[PDB]
Amino acid sequence: GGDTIFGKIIRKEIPAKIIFEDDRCLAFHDISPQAPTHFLVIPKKHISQISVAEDDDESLLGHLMIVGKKCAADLGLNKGYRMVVNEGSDGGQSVYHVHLHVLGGRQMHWPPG
Amino acid sequence: RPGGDTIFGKIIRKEIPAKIIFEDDRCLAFHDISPQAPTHFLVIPKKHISQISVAEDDDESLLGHLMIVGKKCAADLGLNKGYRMVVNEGSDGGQSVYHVHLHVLGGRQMHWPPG
Ligand SMILES: Nc1ncnc2c1ncn2[C@@H]1O[C@H](COP(=O)(O)O)[C@@H](O)[C@H]1O
């Protein structure tokens, strides 16, 4: 699970509002939401950042997106949404555990930050 | 047609020009014509999928491949300080081209919220 706050969430050591879980990922609402709906999908495998993801992780990363789109549908995001992965300082990555943001429930703007 | 009817299908089939960064049997990476950061490119599947909301379960590996190719291209382009990957879905996402694609933006500080 790794040595970050997302590791603690995966291990159930600290609370989060969990939307979905399977054997390889977890989806939960962001504690600092930037839209009326704002959740994260994260792998249980501790990949610190997308830049170090291995080729073998390919389908796992895609799994985050499929889970993300399924959760968005369940949460009634029928007008759309934005998915985001942040890498490093320029990317504004807040936690060094790969996470896919899903934001919706309002018009998302351009540029995306 | 392989690649679909959108402008991105035409790019895939070399019918309209693009500044291509990477190409394989599954995907294509090329620079965005309206960049929102000093470096701003797209990674798209060669298979037409209109939007992420209609992607099939068995599209998992392909979607992941877009991300892996995205991060490799970013490294090759020297985005060592980081970058942001984005998918715009539907009206609230601001989607304008209905062929699934991953934006990769870098070369400046990205801000929060992401739009
Ligand atoms: N012919 C083209 N070549 C490269 N990028 C394009 C082209 N046409 C549109 N785009 C970009 O594709 C994106 C489509 O918007 P969206 O669907 O919200 O991602 C925008 O960033 C456009 O600038």
Residue numbers in the entry:
A (entry chain A): 14 to 126
B (entry chain B): 12 to 126
Question: Could you give the paper's own sentences about this structure?
Answer:
Diadenosine-5′,5-P1,P4-tetraphosphate (Ap4A) is a ubiquitous second messenger from bacteria to higher eukaryotes, which responds to environmental stresses and cell cycle phases. Ap4A then binds to the histidine triad nucleotide-binding protein 1 (HINT1), thereby disrupting the protein–protein interaction with microphthalmia-associated transcription factor (MITF), and the released MITF eventually promotes the transcription of mast cell activation genes. The HINT1 protein is a compact and symmetric dimer, with two adenosine pockets at opposite sides. Here we report that Ap4A specifically polymerizes HINT1 into (HINT1-Ap4A)n (HAn) filaments in solution and in the activated RBL cells.
HINT1 was reported to efficiently hydrolyze aminoacyl-adenylate (aa-AMP) and ADP, but neither ATP nor ApnA (such as Ap3A, Ap4A, and Ap5A). For comparison, we also solved the HINT1WT-ATP and HINT1WT-Ap5A structures at resolutions of 1.52 and 1.31 Å, respectively. Consistent with previous reports, two HINT1 molecules formed a dimer through the five-stranded β-sheet and the central helix in the crystal structure. Despite having co-crystallized with different ligands, the three structures were nearly identical, with root mean square deviations (RMSDs) < 0.083 Å. However, in all the three structures, only the electron density corresponding to an AMP molecule was observed in the adenosine pocket, indicating that the ligands had been hydrolyzed by the HINT1WT protein during the crystallization, which took 3–7 days at 18 °C with a high protein concentration of ~2 mM.
